[PDB]
A paper describes a structure:
HG3.17 was evolved from HG3, a higher-activity mutant (S265T) of the in silico design HG2 that was engineered post-design to reduce the active-site conformational heterogeneity observed by molecular dynamics analysis of HG25. Over an evolutionary trajectory that yielded the HG3.3b, HG3.7, and HG3.14 intermediates, a total of 17 mutations were introduced into HG3 to produce HG3.17, resulting in a catalytic efficiency increase of approximately three orders of magnitude. To evaluate changes to the HG3 conformational ensemble along its evolutionary trajectory, we solved room-temperature (277 K) X-ray crystal structures of all HG-series Kemp eliminases, both in the presence and absence of bound 6NT.
Numbering used by the authors: 4 to 302
The structure:
Amino acid sequence: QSIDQLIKARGKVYFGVATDQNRLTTGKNAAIIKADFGMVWPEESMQWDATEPSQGNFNFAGADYLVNWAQQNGKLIGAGCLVWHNFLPSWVSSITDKNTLINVMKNHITTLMTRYKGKIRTWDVVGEAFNEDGSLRQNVFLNVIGEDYIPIAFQTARAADPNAKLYIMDYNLDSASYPKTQAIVNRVKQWRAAGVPIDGIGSQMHLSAGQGAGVLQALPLLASAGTPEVSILMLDVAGASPTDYVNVVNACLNVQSCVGITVMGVADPDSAFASSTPLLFDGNFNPKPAYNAIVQNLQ
């Protein structure tokens, strides 16, 4: 039973999964993604250090492979992250001149999005921009450009591909009482009021056991920012309890603007957190109790 087909039947857009050429060419990953998922999300091949390892010298081979595989198999594509502090080459973080960095950032955004224009459903434009107390995270963009780097990034992305949905994303947005959750809602409200084209908030749900229950209140709070969409991505759950996974799915179903869920890989041994067995398929590529519980809940 395909959880993507079942979640579409309930009115959502997709159940997706993070992957890349390394996974699609080994084991049973390709067969499972074909059968059970409706959207793919490159784990590393679209990040800055992979795509622009030297300034103006782009490398698209891995990203091209993923996009072509998705189109051939009828899958939606989400891609990112265009601007964040992870996967960032030193040549970028060493820039100290504001105009130089604005132009570098705009060029990185425009080049990636133009190459795949019309083919990408969702771009993660800005990621992990907030500290745990709700202040903005001090990365090179904030240090050199200032808080305007976020509006500039989204305005540039919107001009490059008006078809794509443009997201901001962060982690630890899983509790409605946590300062970070309330801060991103307030800031996104203000940005949208100023005309900034933020289409979505993506919640990076790398969850500890038992945190699914709190998502039932956190996700509606994120939806109150008034973006056209919200999504769940990078989802995994330590221990992979059915209770946590079903709670996360029910939160999605309860929030009308939540378009879908993307899990953080297929099989446990390929997770960065493999020792906590946090995914929906085990090391033999067999569906786990959590997978069957999602199927049963959606039916």
